[PDB]
């Protein structure tokens, strides 16, 4: 019998590492179905904000206009998605954009040659002014009521150092990109995670004792922190299983072709969530759980 | 022609890394693997993206239709 | 010894500053040498 209590008694979380960008925790005694559901919801259905509808006034740059629009829409934005709501479809496109769900990112740049251009200067950082357009140049501007709401939030790209376009003197860019809420399953630019994946904990079943120099090489097959030599009795024991990446270098040697089995525990996942800069991986996982729960709840309460 | 904002396979941003990679490679005798390690790229999906970018926009820019040559 | 190498620094250098001396990639020109040499042999070389 499986019950909610019989699952709560055995399930556990071991947050091995944490950071504002990358988490690495463990889900134990949970089903591969639910762990995979969390992973997929996390990588696709967790909302985020990225520019969608660009507006271009001039683009004399070498970069094609649509290529620049794609690059601009790609860049992550250090915006909490919960600060702005969702956009409409049936509403007129002149009126679908409110001050509660849209972020405007102007970018006005004009490359001009540096009059004090040194002789023998090859690096363009001296020969031209504003030759390189960086994502820092995307300058958020408040609209309507945004002044008294997003004041403390310095809306900037989650990376201000991503390169947008390389210019030449005379060439100009002048655009305004509207940002809205979206999800990863729609377009890969809304995915709030650089990655989100797990792996079952490797299992190393040593059947016959490995003693002497044989255990010394048997340890060298695995990563350095996986197998250890016992102090007193010269042997091999599994020191840290998580540290092992399953490469099966042992199986290439016949002396270990019958002394070890490389199994794998089927209920012990090792998640690793890297935020794209928009949020933090602990909150990404929290919202993945909340999305799965709200999805099951909406299915439950939806009339049949 | 110009460095992509996000790595195709995963999504790890490699577009804020091209100048850093070039600087690491030219200022010191850093090999490409070491530079890609120090730049935050440990999976080969990210590593090849900056190991194998051509940056053809340099050759592209040298034909300016708005400058005397 | 490494068998090959991404000459990324050289590639960026040749993108930024094309050589003013004899062009790089010498073997890319012996490839076309047939057509150019054929045309140049009718209005140059011995006997006019």
């Amino acid at each position: 019998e499986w019950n909610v209590e019989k699952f709560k008694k055995d399930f556990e979380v071991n947050i091995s590492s944490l950071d504002a960008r990358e988490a690495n925790f463990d889900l134990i005694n949970i089903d591969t179905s639910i762990a995979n559901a969390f992973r997929r919801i996390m990588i696709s259905e967790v909302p985020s904000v990225a520019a969608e509808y660009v507006y271009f006034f001039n683009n004399t740059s070498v970069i094609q206009d649509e290529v620049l629009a794609h690059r601009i829409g790609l860049v992550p934005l250090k915006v909490d998605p919960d600060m702005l709501t969702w956009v409409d479809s049936n509403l007129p496109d002149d009126e679908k954009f409110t001050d509660e769900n849209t972020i405007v990112l102007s970018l006005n740049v004009k490359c001009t040659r540096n009059p004090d251009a040194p002789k023998g200067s090859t690096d363009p950082k001296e020969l031209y002014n504003n030759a390189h357009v960086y994502a820092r140049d995307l300058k958020f501007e408040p609209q309507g009521r945004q002044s008294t709401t997003f004041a403390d939030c310095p809306v900037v790209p989650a990376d201000p150092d991503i390169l947008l376009a390389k210019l030449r003197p005379g060439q100009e860019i002048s655009l305004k990109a509207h940002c809205i809420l979206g999800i990863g399953g729609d377009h890969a630019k809304f995915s709030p995670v650089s990655t989100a994946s797990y792996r079952l904990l490797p299992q190393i079943n040593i059947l016959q004792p490995i003693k002497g120099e044989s255990a010394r090489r048997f340890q060298k097959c695995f990563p350095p922190g996986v197998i250890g030599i016992d102090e007193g009795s010269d042997e091999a024991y599994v020191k840290d299983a998580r540290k092992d990446t399953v490469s099966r270098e042992v199986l290439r040697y016949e002396e270990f072709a019958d002394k070890v089995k490389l199994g794998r525990v089927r209920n012990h996942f090792i998640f690793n969530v890297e935020s794209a800069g928009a949020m933090t991986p602990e909150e990404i996982f929290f919202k993945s759980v909340r999305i799965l729960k709200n999805k099951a709840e909406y299915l439950k309460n939806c009339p049949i | 022609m110009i460095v992509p904002v996000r790595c195709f396979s995963c999504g790890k941003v490699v577009g804020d890394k091209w100048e850093s990679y070039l600087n690491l490679l030219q200022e010191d005798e850093l090999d490409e693997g070491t530079a890609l390690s120090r730049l935050g790229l440990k999976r080969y999906c990210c590593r090849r993206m900056i190991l194998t970018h051509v940056d053809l926009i340099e050759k592209f820019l040298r034909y300016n239709p708005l400058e005397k040559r | 010894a490494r068998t090959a190498d991404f000459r990324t620094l050289e590639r960026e250098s040749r993108f930024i500053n094309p050589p003013k001396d004899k062009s790089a990639f010498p073997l890319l020109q012996e490839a076309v040498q047939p057509h150019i040499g054929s045309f140049n042999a009718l209005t140059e070389g011995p006997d006019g």
């Binding site: 091995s16 590492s17 994946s197 990563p223 998580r242 990446t245 090792i270 690793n272 | - | -």
Partner: peptide, 19 residues
Amino acid sequence: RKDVPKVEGLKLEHFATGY
């Protein structure tokens, strides 16, 4: 014929997640 030259000084690149 000498064999293909070996790229020497090679270290361990793949470390498990969290490592």
